[PDB]
Amino acid sequence: QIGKIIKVSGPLVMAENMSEASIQDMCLVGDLGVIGEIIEMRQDVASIQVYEETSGIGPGEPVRSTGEALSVELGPGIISQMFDGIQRPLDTFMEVTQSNFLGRGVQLPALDHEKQWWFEATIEEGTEVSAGDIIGYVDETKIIQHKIMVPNGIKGTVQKIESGSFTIDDPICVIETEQGLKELTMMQKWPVRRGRPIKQKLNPDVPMITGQRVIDTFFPVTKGGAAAVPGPFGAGKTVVQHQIAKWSDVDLVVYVGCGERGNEMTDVVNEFPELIDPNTGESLMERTVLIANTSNMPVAAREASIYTGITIAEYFRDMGYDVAIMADSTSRWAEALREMSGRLEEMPGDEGYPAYLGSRLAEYYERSGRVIALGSDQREGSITAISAVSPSGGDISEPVTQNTLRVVKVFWGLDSSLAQKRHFPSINWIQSYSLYSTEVGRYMDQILQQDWSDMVTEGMRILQEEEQLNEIVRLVGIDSLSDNDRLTLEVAKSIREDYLQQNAFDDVDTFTSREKQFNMLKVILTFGKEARKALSLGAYFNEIMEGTVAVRERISRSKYIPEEELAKISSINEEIKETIQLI
Amino acid sequence: YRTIKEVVGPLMAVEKVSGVKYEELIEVRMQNGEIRRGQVLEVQEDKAMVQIFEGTSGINLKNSSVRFLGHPLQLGVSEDMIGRVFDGLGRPKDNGPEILPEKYLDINGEVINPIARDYPDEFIQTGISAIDHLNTLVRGQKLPVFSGSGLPHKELAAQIARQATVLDSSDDFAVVFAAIGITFEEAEFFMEDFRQTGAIDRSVMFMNLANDPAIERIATPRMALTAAEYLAYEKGMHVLVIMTDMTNYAEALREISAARREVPGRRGYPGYLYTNLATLFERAGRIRGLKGSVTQIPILTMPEDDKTHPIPDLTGYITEGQIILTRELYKSGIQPPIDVLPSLSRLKDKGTGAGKTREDHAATMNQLFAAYAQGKQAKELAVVLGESALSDIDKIYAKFAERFENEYVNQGFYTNRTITETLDLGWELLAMLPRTELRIKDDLLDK
Amino acid sequence: EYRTIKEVVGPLMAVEKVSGVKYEELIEVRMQNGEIRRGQVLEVQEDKAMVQIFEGTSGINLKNSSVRFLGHPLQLGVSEDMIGRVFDGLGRPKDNGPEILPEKYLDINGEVINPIARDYPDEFIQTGISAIDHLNTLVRGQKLPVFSGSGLPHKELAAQIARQATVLDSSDDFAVVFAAIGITFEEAEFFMEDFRQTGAIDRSVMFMNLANDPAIERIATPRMALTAAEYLAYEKGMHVLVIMTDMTNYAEALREISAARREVPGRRGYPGYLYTNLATLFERAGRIRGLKGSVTQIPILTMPEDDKTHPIPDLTGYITEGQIILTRELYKSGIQPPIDVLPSLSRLKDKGTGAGKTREDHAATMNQLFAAYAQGKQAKELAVVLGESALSDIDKIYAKFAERFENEYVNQGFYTNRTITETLDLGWELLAMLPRTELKRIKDDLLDKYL
């Protein structure tokens, strides 16, 4: 069936004689053969949303269905690649097109179909298998096992199977099904608009070890949980998503650049191959998938990248891994939904965005979480959604943030006067929250045999006391302020400048171990509590501050402590009990 | 019918049909053999507009077909529903028995004759001091909770559901719980709490998630209320209906409305929103000559915490008061974070007193309210004056207000307070204040 | 040639009975009176064609006119011979100079640089202005905008960076592309004289679009300029600096076309696609793997009411790599240019600093002169009505620091060229205020350099 363009109006194209096709079918449009998706059909006439610029195309030109919805190839040679919105790998692109530029019409398999991979078989002939059962694996990286699973929709027994070297096109397994014989490869396709099936969702109850002090301590995210990072321009989001991406105790990172800067995407493929995880000792790229749809790339393919990312994240989830997905920025995706809706003449919602915005965001954030994957083994996996949001004027009351915040439990708000006044990372310790705090409390205090949540409560309480005393300095003045309350500021001073503040380009302050965090906070918590005991005994606030300057601000440099052996700041506690017997 | 002519978004045009009714259910037989359900939104001459629940992807028009089922959304009711979980169409979600229904009812219901309703009479112990004492829930009342994103309405909801009891000789409340467009996390909280406490053996659950089709969202409350009226008005049960989150119901409304190409009224929402809402919340109360009853506690998040937003505004015109959670309270670790001053129950009057509660209910309630008002005023005026405007006679209210929030209101989501304990605490609190603060002869009786 | 114009509605025309017409193709109307007018195809359908006429449709008689479809979109004729020539918003010759027989015709939309092929902005550009070169450094391939206001000396500064911009090799492989967007004849002539007067014209290519030129040609101007910039950078190996003013004018035009096409207004009157649109301009700046030469961007915009959160500076900010902010509190006095360093950011400062690019001392002295000024700007701000005038021996030399910081160092005048050495040289004698110990850091690996 040859279709024929009857109308080209922006990214929107209309073609007659399209009746053999289906809604959501991908098709090649015009003489250029540009990528498009069918979104409506009236009689034989398809309305097509084109994922490339339509300039120079017009009525009379041909249109062919691919007879397949927007999909991703899923198999080995995925890890470490950089794809575009629709999963074209950018380096092969360069090579096939002999060009430094995105040309229209180019058609690429996502994965290298020619690469020989070693298949190690793991299931013996004669086993009953269904969707999600691992039949073998491949050492795709040094660390990561690419585990090869039966595709969804397959059921039966393993007829033949053997370890060996193959391509992703070669049949490695034979299954006798209900219909008959079916041969599988190391590669499967999945339609990105459809969450990959699972046994059941679980409650995400284990904290992410990001190592970023402020996050893990006061606004933790669980494995399976979801965080939002909304903020203005020059907030530093980017120099933060990196930190998440590098340190989180996950297995794979999917880092999706939806409609942001091109340069930032380069910085990633520059700096990620240099970012070596100690122990494993191999580059961060070796555990990262990049999808890039830059701000000047086709708008319609912005929504493509978001789905591409998360579907890939689902695949590795299904193998029993923990994945982290970074979508940046999710504002540009909604902006692409606004544009299409206008073109389709739909009834607008708030600020022009479509009325099905909330649903979309919901459909996305719910594809994330902790699951029991399919398969007899009943293995368990997770995806952790971290999303940057970029509201107009940094104003959060905006629809994309509000719809996101009603489906996510973690809010890392980026202020302007923090970044502008050198407070990294720029996180609003008042406005921000994690509705996981409570449960992470139970988890830690019990993992440490400690009262860490009681400590967490006390710190936040001190930052929320300081908040109203600062709007009280804005009155009579700092001079007339009482002893016990003067102390409250200088403990908060400590927390702000020492705990919360973190350097991304430092050799040691880029990451903080879980127990290194525990000591630091306790080192702060005894200081505040014991200086309180000096006030209630008749020693003025002034006497205490002049009383310790070096040893009190040995805690200022204590964020820079390394780890030759494990014990480091396991010293200052019995050393404060010294000056409380002296001063 | 092999006659699909248009597919636009999740909408289908079907031609040459006849006998087709508005809101009638349909099934799509897709070309791969797959079946999707839908509903007629529009019907003119020999054509019909349908929306498809599971969206419209994959369909080839020419080779699909539609069946018309001859009946709209119905609920297959039976007493066997107690102790079960369904999605927002009434389909089982607990892998238990397929329930053999007694009959199938239209989920729209019917409007209660205004002269058939009975005045709500009986006090409901929720076991939450701030409601029970200061804003009393009464059997047959509609009393909602207005909250915001992040705020623990979820916790408050589960607590009311575990604890709610009447002081009578029964029966126990049957709980009909409708989750509407909530995250799997929210929902998984509820279903574990109910399983943990055994509150499920007393409940009927309708679970509809955020990634569920917006029409199903729309159906969810109508399904739950159909269940509730059946249990109450046909089986003589006292039913307590809790619904979160109505904001979600509303958001779903705009979505369908946009799809039907309607024209929005105040603040983006539909003209008919009011009627829609009343349509839900008036399915409640006692009926003359009937043993059972339906009491509603709708729960909703206020967009941008805006009281005047249509959602909270219209709800207020329809329901008999409301309970507000504030951020100022929540952040201050107060649980449940109920602000009493803007909170109101309209039916509290006849619900309380001697033989309902205790002889002193009204009295303490007004005084605690007035005192708290003065204490907030003392704290608010501690911005400029800071201290010294309350050297003796006014100091106490500030202290009072603080402790009222810390001891009385903040009680914990797992603490169940009998009305005895609530009232008692309130005096043990009022005692801080000098007696020149007016109680009656009874100021010396409960002292 | 089609004598089949069906409909004229304002600037918009419908042609039917056509065939082979493509979206965004150029057209020419041949009016009954012999006049020729160019336009473009906005929409195409069946045998119909919806077009916009750049000069509008006043005077047209439908029945006796005709449309020619040219078989191409908006293009630029390119050649090495552009340098030292003046063009309008569409690249039509403006200076009455020689006939241009071009090499190849290029579509002004260009093509997106593959993220993989892109090279990170790198290497220093000598501007001649301290407060930028030492504190918010211009790396090659950077988009570093200048925000401003009306009546501020953004104009005066623009042409300076044209004269005084160069690389540390030679100015022969360095070329300026100057684009004026929607400006007054007088502002235009200000740029004509300063360029012709200082000879800096013969390293520049100029695109001059005026306030009274048609809106569509305002829109086309930056893409004309950037097409020439991409050409000379990547086809000819030059380091190309692109100065565009005023981007606020660009935005109003875009908004005027939007409303003319009956489109739905987005935030504060402006199109929902303002972001993406700007992005398609600012992203043309950069470097590429393998190929020599770059495209650097300095867009100038005037902020309406000086509101940071306005769609114009707001969306500029989310796309560009930093910002140069001009305040009026500094412009009140002779301070030129009045650049407040506090909100000024160059997100790519390190990539244009250090040994062999500028100096061994650059990085440290930047964050030194910066952190101390934060305490000074506040000290001088602390009035005698709060108050008061009793700040200690700490803030009798800190407020004396922030005061001398503007009047002498930043206040450098609109015609003084400060070679990177000069600027760094002035940083030392200027920081000779306190004694050594008040400056952190660091000490012993230094501790003097220099010193």
Swiss-Prot record, chain A:
Its EC number is 7.2.2.1. Pfam families: ATP-synt_ab (PF00006), ATP-synt_ab_N (PF02874), ATP-synt_ab_Xtn (PF16886), ATP-synt_VA_C (PF22919). Keywords: ATP-binding, Ion transport, Nucleotide-binding, Sodium, Sodium transport, Translocase, Transport. It is an enzyme of class 7 (translocase). It comes from the Bacteria. It catalyses: 4 Na(+)(in) + ATP + H2O = 4 Na(+)(out) + ADP + phosphate + H(+). One of its GO terms (cellular component) is proton-transporting ATP synthase complex. One of its GO terms (molecular function) is ATP binding. ATP binds at G231, P232, F233, G234, A235, G236, K237, T238. Induction: By increasing intracellular Na(+) concentration. The keyword ATP-binding applies. GO terms for biological process: proton motive force-driven plasma membrane ATP synthesis. Involved in ATP-driven sodium extrusion. Belongs to the ATPase alpha/beta chains family. HAMAP family: ATP_synth_A_arch. This is V-type sodium ATPase catalytic subunit A.
Curated annotation (Swiss-Prot), chain C:
Keywords: Ion transport, Sodium, Sodium transport, Transport. GO terms for biological process: proton motive force-driven plasma membrane ATP synthesis; sodium ion transport. GO terms for molecular function: ATP binding; proton-transporting ATP synthase activity, rotational mechanism. CDD domains: ATP-synt_V_A-type_beta_C, ATP-synt_V_A-type_beta_N, V_A-ATPase_B. Pfam families: ATP-synt_ab (PF00006), ATP-synt_ab_N (PF02874), ATP-synt_VA_C (PF22919). InterPro entries: ATP-synt_VA_C, ATPase_a/bsu_AS, ATPase_F1/V1/A1_a/bsu_N, ATPase_F1/V1/A1_a/bsu_nucl-bd, P-loop_NTPase, V-ATPase_su_B/beta. Induction: By increasing intracellular Na(+) concentration. HAMAP family: ATP_synth_B_arch (MF_00310). Belongs to the ATPase alpha/beta chains family. Involved in ATP-driven sodium extrusion. This is V-type sodium ATPase subunit B. It comes from Enterococcus hirae (strain ATCC 9790 / DSM 20160 / JCM 8729 / LMG 6399 / NBRC 3181 / NCIMB 6459 / NCDO 1258 / NCTC 12367 / WDCM 00089 / R). The lineage of its organism: Bacteria, Bacillati, Bacillota, Bacilli, Lactobacillales. The gene is ntpB.
